[PDB]
């Protein structure tokens, strides 16, 4: 699904060419989806503002098919967060992000729906059972 | 209700000046609503990047009021997706659609909240019934 | 929580630099949240068409955390239209709002997740039970 959109005040001319990049191979890993579908929208220098000031300020969503809860969420949005303050410059008294969870049968990647039972992340529970025996009867 | 939102990074000068105003008359019809009411949002030559790499790639957003399921979901995907390939030159293995239902009582057209009638499709099936009688006892 | 985002068709050169300012001071008391974290972002001079034409147009959304419902959106719409009729010079038969309710534990502000008991208006009731007791029993 992953789609990771940025919407910040912050002029192009100040952002690392490589900014893009490094969030996208972060958030590929995060969500635990093929990289391949992973979308990153950098909206700099928007006519964006926060408290009515203008100051450097983020607004990102996550959009994901499952992955997402109040454990996972927090994680990624400090690891977000952290990318912005030392890549955008801006603050943390000063960033949002948003996770949106998408319904598997309303989302369309190339000329299909995607799987329900992703949206249930029952690939990693399947992995978890996995794993256990490895390391737990071998 | 219906808006349709398409982030591409396909530069505005490789779009066709009559692409808004095709996917507006394929949407109204799709999502069998006035054409008065659709919006198409283009946000070409966008900072969108998929996989890590800039090739012709497209993220679209349907927001509807009712309309929306699994089964037309798949239909509207196919024809937008056709209507991407073909008109931006983008891929289908670079296409992306998501399908937001909205509440009716949570979307404000004209100083008025929308029926939540039509949330419900009530006005497909009174039309279903309708064709009914007309073919089954003239 | 909140998070107005304005997509219109009207160029930036025609916007009053205090209408994101002014539209600020609005929801912020409209939503009842701090004015530090109520972002404005404008999208003027968007490719954003409604219709098939290319009048003044304007589809906004609101993501708040609670706060929204039925009663209070259809008031906000109007505000909010009010404001776009005379500041932007759309016109009202050109004008949809889409009211997003945001869960508490999928946003992030500030290297925290928001508190639960916030989308569910409990500092409001709590307000309600204080101002009673007030002018109830002084
Ligand atoms: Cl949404």
């Known amino acids: 699904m992953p789609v990771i959109t940025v919407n910040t005040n912050v002029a192009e001319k100040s952002i690392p060419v490589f900014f893009q ?3 996208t191979n972060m958030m590929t890993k995060a969500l635990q989806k093929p990289k391949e579908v992973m979308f990153v929208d950098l909206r700099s220098g928007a006519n964006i503002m926060m408290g009515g000031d203008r100051n450097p300020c983020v607004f990102a969503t996550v959009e994901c098919i499952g992955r997402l809860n109040p454990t996972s969420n927090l994680a990624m949005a400090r690891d977000m967060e952290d990318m ?17 969870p998408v319904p598997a049968l309303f989302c369309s990647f190339n000329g299909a729906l995607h799987d329900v039972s992703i949206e249930r992340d029952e690939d990693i529970i399947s992995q978890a059972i996995a794993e256990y025996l490895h390391h737990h009867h071998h």
Chains 1, 2, 3 share one sequence.
């Open 21 to 23: 990049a490094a969030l």
């Open 84 to 100: 912005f303050i030392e890549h955008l410059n801006v603050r943390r008294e000063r960033i949002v992000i948003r996770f949106i």
